[PDB]
Write a protein that binds this DNA or RNA. Structure first.
Ligand code: MG
Ligand code: MG
Ligand code: MG
Ligand code: MG
Ligand code: MG
Ligand code: MG
Ligand code: MG
Ligand code: MG
Ligand code: MG
Ligand code: MG
Ligand code: MG
Ligand code: MG
Ligand code: MG
Ligand code: MG
Ligand code: MG
Ligand code: MG
Ligand code: ZN
Lengths: 50, 336, 169, 195, 138
RNA sequence: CAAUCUAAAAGGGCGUCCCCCGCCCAAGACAG
RNA sequence: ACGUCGUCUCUUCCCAUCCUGGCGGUGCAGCAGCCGCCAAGGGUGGGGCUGCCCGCCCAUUAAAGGGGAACGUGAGAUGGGUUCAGACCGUCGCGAGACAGGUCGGUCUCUACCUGUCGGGGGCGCUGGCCGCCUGAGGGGAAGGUGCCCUCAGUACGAGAGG
C-alpha cells in the first residue's frame, strides 16, 4: 500500500495525528495537555510506524 | 431468577383476556392509501369456511416460482354493504381529539335497520346535508355508516350489523366528502373496494372456547412425571413469590377465545360474483351456501364460522408489493 | 495481612513495651537514612522537602517500607546518591494485634469468637500526629522537580493524606 | 474574572448591508446581504448586545463573567465569516484517496453519490443542502462552494465522515508490521474563497 | 469453490432425536448409529425440548454397530429417509418405510461410495454430493 | 436548615469564583 | 413453634454484559484474538456423572452471564441427602453408649375466613329516559428475537498459507 507524498501527508494528518486519553479513551487534539472529556493529563500520542 | 432460562408462558400483550365487548370487530386503525380515486378503505363479510386451492406461485424470487402449490384458503360470504349515513369528523381544538360534527341519513332507511335503530319515519336528508356542508371547511375525515345485508348471506338472519368505514384513496378531503355523499342509499360490492391479488388486514372476534385452564390458556407445562404430583398436574406449581403478591403477569385460568384480534397481510386470491361456483355440493359445514359474491383469502382468518370479519387495506405492508397481475387459482377443493 | 483500614485509626493506648509482649515482631525496615548521610557532605545541600502528615493515624511498617523503596529508588535513579539525603523520620514502635483462631500460638487462641479476645501480635505501626514529618529530604535546588515527584510517589503508598512542604535549611 | 463593561467592533465591508432585528428579550436575527447573496443567522438567548454604528456592528456585554465575555470574540468571528461569505464566498476542497478500488464520485441533481468505495456494492448517497454547489474536478478532487461557511464546512465534513467506517467495519489504519494500512476515503484538505 | 446446494430449508417435522438409533444407508462400514447432536441454525431448542432433525438435516452420530474400527467413533451424517410424515412446501405429504442416514464429512461429502434405497429430494437438493450417488430420488 | 435516618474515600479537574508568591515586559514581553 | 438441603413448576427485579445493538483502543494486514465504554429490549438451550449445590465432562451453539425476591415459591409438588425411633461396619468407651465417618429402611396433615390475582355477573351514577355509531385520557405488550445459505469473491488483505 503506497501513496505519493502529497496524499501520504493528508492521510497522516487525518488518521495519525491525535492523542488518546489513557483514562477514558477519548480522541484528543495532537497538542492537547488535558483530555477534552475527563480533563486528565494521561494522554498518549498515536504514532505512525515505518 | 429462574433456574434455567426460558421465555415466559404466553403473551401479556393481550391482557386482560376478557370476552370482547362486542361481537362485531371495532377497528382502531385505518391506513392512508393513495389509490388515485376515492373509495372505501374496508369491507365487512361473513366467514363461511375453509378450503384449499392449487395456486401458481407468482413470486419471481421465490424458490417455488412458477410451480403449482397447495394453499389453505378462507372463504368469505360477502353480500353488498348498504350505505345508510355519512358522518363528518373534525379535531377538537382543546385536546386534538377527533369528534363527529354531524351526519346525514338516507330518507327511507330499509325496514331491517329498524330492528337495531330508533329511526324516524322519514329523514329529511336535504336539511341534514345542508347542515353538514357548514362543517366542510373544518373536516379532516369522512366515514360512511354501512349496514350488512344478512338476508343475502348464507346465515339468513335479519338483524344487520352497523359500522363505520372511512373513505380514502385521495388526499383531498373535499373529493372524499363528495364521493361519500354520492354513496348515500346505494350498495357497495367487494369489487368496488378491493382488487384481486392485493393484501388486506383482517379483524374479527376469535372463536369462543369458554373457561379454560392455565395449561391451554397460557401453555404452561403439565407438571413433569405427571403421576407423581398430589393435587393434580394441570397447573402451575407456585402462584408467586412472597413479594410482590399475585401479580397480574401470573398465568391464571379464565375466559379463552372470543377476543378481538388483528392479522396482517392476507392475500385476496379471488373476488367472485356468484358463490355457487365455490360452494361445495354438500354445502359449507355448519354454515350453508353462498349465493352472491365471495372473497377468497389466502391463509386463515380469526373467528367462528359465521363471524362478521372486517377487511381493510394493510397498515404494515411489506416492502415489495405482490405482482400486479391477478393470481392464478387453478383449482379449488370444493370443485370436481 | 488485613486491609490497612483495619489498623488506621488510633483506638487505644500505645503497645510498645516489648518486655511484656510475647512474640513482638521484628522491624522489617533495613535502613532509615538513605543517600549521602555524612554531615560534611550534607552541607552542600541547601533545600529541605518534607512529607508531612495531614491527619492522625497509624501507618503500618510495610507501608512505610513501600514508601521508602519507591522514593529512594526514584532519587537514586534521577538525582544520584551523592546529591541528596533522605530520612524516614518515624519508627514503627506500636505493635498491632489480631484476634484470629490459630494453631501453635497458645491455648487461648483456640477459643473461637470474642472469648479471650486479646489478640496476638500481627505487625507494627507508627502512630503519627497531624503536622508530623514522615519523610525528610535534603537536596540541591536544581533537583526540586525530582524531589517533589519522589515524595508524590511515597505519598501514594501511605494510608493517610499528606502534604509536601519545601523550605530552605 | 469579572467584566464591568466590554465592547467589540466588526467593520462592515463596502457593498454589505446588515440588518439587526430583536426577535425576543435576548434573541437577535442578523441579516447580511452582499454581492453574492443573503445570509440569515440567529443569536438566541444571548447576553451580547448587538447594534449598528455608521458602518460597524457593535457588540457589548455588561456586568459579565468569563462565560459571557467569551461570547464577544465568538460573535465577532461569526460575523466576519458572514461578511466574507457574501463578498468572496467559501470553497472547501476535498481529495479522493484510494488504494485498490477507484472511487467514482458524481453529482446528480442535489444528490452526491460515491461508488466503489473499497469495492462495496452499497452506494454512499448524500443530500446536498440548498446554497451548496458541488463540482467534481477530474477523478481526485471535490469542491464545495457557498456563502454560508458553517453550512459549507458541515457538508464537506459529512462527505469525509461518510467514508470513515465505524464499528466492526473499521479497517486497520496500519499495515502488517507497521506500514500504511487500508486508508481510503475523501479528506477535507483546506478552504479558500471563491473570488 | 464447491458446488452449492439450495439456500432454503423449509420446515420438516423432525423424525429422529437425541439417542435415536438409525440404520445407515451407505457402504461406509457403519450399520447402526446413535444420534447425539443436530448441526446448524435449526438445532437450537428451548428448555426441556429435545433437539431433532428431519430429511436433509445434518446430525452428529456415534457408530454402534458396524466394522470394529468404526465402533464408538463420532461422525456427521445426513438424514435421507424418515418414517415421520412431512409436508413439502408445495403441499404434498410424504412418508418413508424406514429411517436412514448417510455418513458424511463435516463439509457434506459421503464417506461411502454408494447409497442404498431411495433418497428424499430435500437431501439431494441441499447436498449435491449426496445427489451424485442417489440412484432413486423421491 | 443537627443526630436516630438511608452515605462516601484515596485520587483526578484553571470546570468555575477567588487569594498569595516568583519571573518577563520600562511597550524591543507571550503567540505567530 | 415463621416447616429444616436440593430439585420441579411459575412470575418478577438488579447489572458489576456471556450473546445480540452502538463505539473506541490494540504489540488491530486478513481470518481470529485481547482490552475499555454505552446499553438489561430479547436470548442464555440439550445431555453424561453425583442426593446434591458447586464442579468436571459430551455434542451443539450467536452465546450457551451472574445475582435478588423470608438462602422467592412444601396450607403448590417431590422427598434422593441431611436430621428421630430398627440394623450393620470401622473407630472410641471397662460399660451402657458415642461419631457433623460409611451404609440399608423409615406417616409430607387442613372443606380457604380475609386479601390478592384471574375471569364472569347485578346495580347506582354520568344533572329527564333511551337507541345506535364514535372519540381516546390513561392502562398492557417482547410481539417479536435471532441464525444460516447464495451473490459480493477465492475478491480486498497477504510472501504464501489463508481469507
Ligand atoms: Mg404423593
Ligand atoms: Mg479503644
Ligand atoms: Mg473512610
Ligand atoms: Mg409465633
Ligand atoms: Mg408460613
Ligand atoms: Mg405455622
Ligand atoms: Mg453498565
Ligand atoms: Mg426459601
Ligand atoms: Mg408440605
Ligand atoms: Mg408456603
Ligand atoms: Mg429419604
Ligand atoms: Mg437413607
Ligand atoms: Mg439417621
Ligand atoms: Mg473395646
Ligand atoms: Mg385446597
Ligand atoms: Mg405504552
Ligand atoms: Zn479522558
Amino acid at each position: 500500500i503506497t501513496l505519493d507524498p502529497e496524499k501520504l501527508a493528508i492521510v497522516l494528518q487525518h488518521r495519525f495525528n491525535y492523542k488518546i486519553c489513557r483514562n477514558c479513551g477519548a480522541r484528543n487534539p495532537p497538542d492537547a495537555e488535558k483530555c477534552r472529556r475527563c480533563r486528565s493529563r494521561n494522554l498518549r500520542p498515536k504514532k505512525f510506524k515505518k | 431468577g429462574l433456574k434455567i432460562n426460558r421465555p415466559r408462558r404466553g403473551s401479556m400483550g393481550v391482557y386482560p383476556r376478557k370476552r370482547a365487548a362486542d361481537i362485531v370487530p371495532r377497528v382502531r386503525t385505518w391506513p392512508e392509501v393513495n389509490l388515485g380515486k376515492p373509495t372505501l378503505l374496508g369491507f365487512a363479510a361473513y366467514k363461511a369456511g375453509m378450503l384449499h386451492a392449487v395456486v401458481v406461485d407468482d413470486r419471481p424470487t421465490s424458490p417455488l416460482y412458477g410451480k403449482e402449490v397447495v394453499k389453505a384458503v378462507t372463504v368469505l360470504d360477502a353480500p353488498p354493504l348498504y350505505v345508510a349515513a355519512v358522518r363528518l369528523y373534525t379535531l377538537d381544538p382543546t385536546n386534538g381529539y377527533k369528534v363527529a360534527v354531524g351526519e346525514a341519513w338516507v330518507s327511507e332507511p330499509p325496514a331491517d335497520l329498524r330492528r337495531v335503530l330508533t329511526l324516524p319515519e322519514k329523514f329529511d336528508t336535504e336539511k341534514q346535508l345542508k347542515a353538514l356542508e357548514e362543517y366542510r371547511d373544518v373536516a379532516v375525515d369522512v366515514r360512511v355508516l354501512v349496514a350488512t345485508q344478512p338476508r343475502l348471506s348464507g346465515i339468513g338472519k335479519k338483524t344487520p350489523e352497523v359500522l363505520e368505514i372511512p373513505v380514502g384513496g385521495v388526499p383531498s378531503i373535499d373529493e372524499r366528502i363528495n364521493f361519500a355523499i354520492s354513496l348515500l342509499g346505494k350498495t357497495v360490492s367487494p369489487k368496488d373496494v378491493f382488487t384481486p391479488g392485493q393484501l388486506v388486514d383482517v379483524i374479527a372476534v376469535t372463536k369462543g372456547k369458554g373457561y379454560q385452564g392455565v395449561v391451554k390458556r397460557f401453555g404452561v407445562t403439565i407438571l413433569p412425571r405427571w403421576h407423581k404430583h398430589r393435587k393434580g398436574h394441570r397447573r402451575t406449581g407456585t402462584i408467586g413469590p412472597q413479594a410482590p403478591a399475585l401479580m397480574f403477569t401470573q398465568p391464571r385460568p379464565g375466559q379463552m377465545g372470543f377476543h378481538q384480534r388483528t392479522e396482517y397481510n392476507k392475500r385476496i386470491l379471488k373476488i367472485g360474483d356468484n358463490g355457487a361456483e365455490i360452494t361445495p355440493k354438500s354445502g359449507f359445514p355448519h354454515y350453508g351456501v353462498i349465493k352472491g359474491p365471495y372473497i377468497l383469502l389466502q391463509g386463515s382468518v380469526p373467528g367462528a364460522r359465521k363471524r362478521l370479519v372486517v377487511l381493510r387495506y394493510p397498515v404494515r405492508p411489506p416492502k415489495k408489493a405482490p405482482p400486479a397481475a391477478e393470481p392464478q387459482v387453478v383449482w379449488v377443493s370444493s370443485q370436481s | 495481612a488485613r486491609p490497612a483500614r483495619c489498623y488506621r485509626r488510633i483506638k487505644g493506648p500505645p503497645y510498645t513495651r516489648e518486655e511484656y509482649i510475647h512474640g513482638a515482631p521484628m522491624i522489617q525496615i533495613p535502613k532509615f537514612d538513605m543517600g549521602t548521610t555524612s554531615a560534611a557532605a550534607r552541607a552542600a545541600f541547601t533545600m529541605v522537602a518534607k512529607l508531612v502528615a495531614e491527619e492522625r493515624g497509624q501507618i503500618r511498617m510495610q507501608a512505610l517500607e513501600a514508601a521508602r523503596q519507591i522514593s529512594s529508588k526514584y532519587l537514586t535513579k534521577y538525582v544520584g546518591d551523592a546529591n541528596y539525603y533522605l530520612r524516614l523520620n518515624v519508627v514503627p514502635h506500636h505493635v498491632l494485634r489480631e484476634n484470629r483462631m490459630l494453631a501453635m500460638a497458645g491455648a487461648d487462641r483456640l477459643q473461637e469468637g470474642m472469648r479471650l479476645a486479646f489478640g496476638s501480635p500481627a505487625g507494627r505501626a507508627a502512630r503519627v500526629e497531624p503536622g508530623q514529618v514522615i519523610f525528610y529530604v535534603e537536596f540541591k535546588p536544581e533537583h526540586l522537580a525530582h524531589v517533589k515527584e519522589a515524595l508524590r510517589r511515597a505519598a501514594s503508598k501511605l494510608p493517610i493524606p499528606t502534604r509536601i512542604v519545601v523550605e530552605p535549611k | 474574572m469579572h467584566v464591568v463593561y466590554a465592547v467589540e467592533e466588526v467593520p462592515i465591508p463596502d457593498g454589505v448591508k446588515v440588518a439587526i432585528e430583536k426577535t425576543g428579550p435576548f434573541d437577535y436575527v442578523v441579516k447580511v446581504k452582499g454581492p453574492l447573496g443573503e445570509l440569515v443567522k440567529e443569536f438566541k438567548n444571548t447576553p451580547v448586545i448587538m447594534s449598528l454604528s455608521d458602518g460597524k456592528v457593535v457588540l457589548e456585554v455588561l456586568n459579565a463573567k468569563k462565560r459571557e465575555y467569551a461570547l464577544l470574540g465568538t460573535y465577532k468571528g461569526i460575523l466576519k465569516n458572514m461578511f466574507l461569505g457574501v463578498t468572496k464566498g467559501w470553497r472547501y476542497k476535498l481529495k479522493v484517496i484510494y488504494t485498490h478500488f477507484p472511487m467514482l464520485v458524481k453529482v446528480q441533481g442535489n444528490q452526491l453519490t460515491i461508488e466503489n468505495f473499497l469495492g462495496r456494492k452499497s452506494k454512499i448517497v448524500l443530500e446536498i443542502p440548498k446554497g451548496v454547489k458541488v463540482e467534481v474536478k477530474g477523478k481526485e478532487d471535490i469542491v464545495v462552494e457557498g456563502i454560508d461557511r458553517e453550512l459549507v464546512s458541515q457538508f464537506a465534513a459529512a462527505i469525509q465522515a461518510a467514508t470513515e467506517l465505524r464499528g466492526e467495519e473499521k479497517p486497520s489504519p496500519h499495515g502488517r508490521e507497521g506500514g500504511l494500512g487500508v486508508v481510503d476515503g475523501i479528506y477535507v484538505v483546506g478552504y479558500e474563497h471563491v473570488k | 469453490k464447491r458446488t452449492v446446494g439450495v439456500p432454503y430449508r423449509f420446515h420438516v417435522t423432525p423424525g429422529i432425536f437425541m439417542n435415536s438409533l438409525v440404520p445407515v444407508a451407505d457402504n461406509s462400514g457403519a450399520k447402526l448409529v446413535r444420534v447425539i447432536g443436530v448441526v446448524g441454525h435449526y438445532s437450537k431448542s428451548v428448555h426441556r425440548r429435545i433437539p431433532g432433525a428431519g430429511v436433509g438435516d445434518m446430525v452428529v452420530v456415534v457408530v454402534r454397530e458396524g466394522k470394529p474400527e468404526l465402533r464408538k467413533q463420532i461422525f456427521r451424517a445426513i438424514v435421507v429417509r424418515q418414517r415421520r410424515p412431512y409436508r413439502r412446501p408445495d403441499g404434498t405429504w410424504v412418508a418413508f418405510e424406514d429411517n436412514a442416514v448417510v455418513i458424511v464429512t463435516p463439509e457434506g461429502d459421503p464417506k461411502g461410495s454408494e447409497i442404498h434405497g431411495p433418497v428424499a429430494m430435500e437431501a439431494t437438493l441441499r447436498w449435491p454430493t449426496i445427489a451424485n450417488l442417489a440412484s432413486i430420488v423421491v
